Amino acid sequence: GKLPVPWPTLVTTLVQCFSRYPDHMKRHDFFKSAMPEGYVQERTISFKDDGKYKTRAVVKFEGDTLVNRIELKGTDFKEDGNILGHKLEYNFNSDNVYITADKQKNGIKANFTVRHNVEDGSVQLADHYQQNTPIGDGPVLLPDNHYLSTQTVLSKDPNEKRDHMVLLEFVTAAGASQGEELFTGVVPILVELDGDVNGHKFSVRGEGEGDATIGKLTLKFIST
Known part of the structure; x- marks a missing residue:
């Protein structure tokens, strides 16, 4: 519970490797190519x-x-x-x-x-x-x-019951290492954030899953 900042301000901080990259752009997917080391x-x-x-x-x-x-x-x-x-x-x-x-x-x-x-x-x-x-x-x-x-x-x-935020997100790109092969199905996601804003300490924990085939992310975040 008890986030000191508004939840929307943390959305961008809280996994662009789940972006859908069109096949004509798969050569340009940095995020998946870095996996598994990341x-x-x-x-x-x-x-x-x-x-x-x-x-x-x-x-x-x-x-x-x-x-x-x-x-x-x-x-x-x-x-x-x-x-x-x-x-x-x-x-x-x-x-x-x-x-x-x-x-x-x-x-x-x-x-x-x-x-x-x-x-x-x-x-x-x-x-x-x-x-x-x-x-x-x-x-x-x-x-x-x-x-x-x-x-x-x-x-x-x-x-x-806890202070929380549910998020659903779709992301698509527009415009070797084999890492992209790790994303061919639904992948579970864990997010952990340790924060200090103006000296106020807080944490967020998130869990959900991602499906890069359609660029989908679904997660629930709770604050602690």
Whole structure:
């Protein structure tokens, strides 16, 4: 229970290896090509006129399960701002995720802005800078420029007692290592986040599954 920030602000932090890559783009799927050893995903998320999140996540297979293990540090949030003031609606819309190769890191960079709806009708922008670096030694795919199109619905579970968020998400790409072969069916997912925002410590644990054949993610997150 008891998340100190609005649940919608954690959605992007809480596994792009489940994106559906069209067959004419399979040569450009970095995320699956890094598996099973995985990749480190790092972001800076700048909430305009407010604070920022800095995240570092390890995304990898642990046996049969895709794991996303995250550390989040949030700083400089305004007490009466949209985030710590809890003025955000559950509703939000995102830009496409624009991906380019990162030649230094043998990985990718990505950039996109999330538009969070505010209770008063204003908008709270969240500007994402992203980099992913492979963990393993195996050959990874460095992609041509492209993007991911993301759709999300947020809900609750009537039988759940703890502070929580149910998420359903569909993501499609648009524009060797054999890692992609690990995604040919439904894959279980575990997400763990250790967070500090403005000094307030918290954790989130998530479980669900992903089906990259249709780009589907379904998970329930609880806070602790």
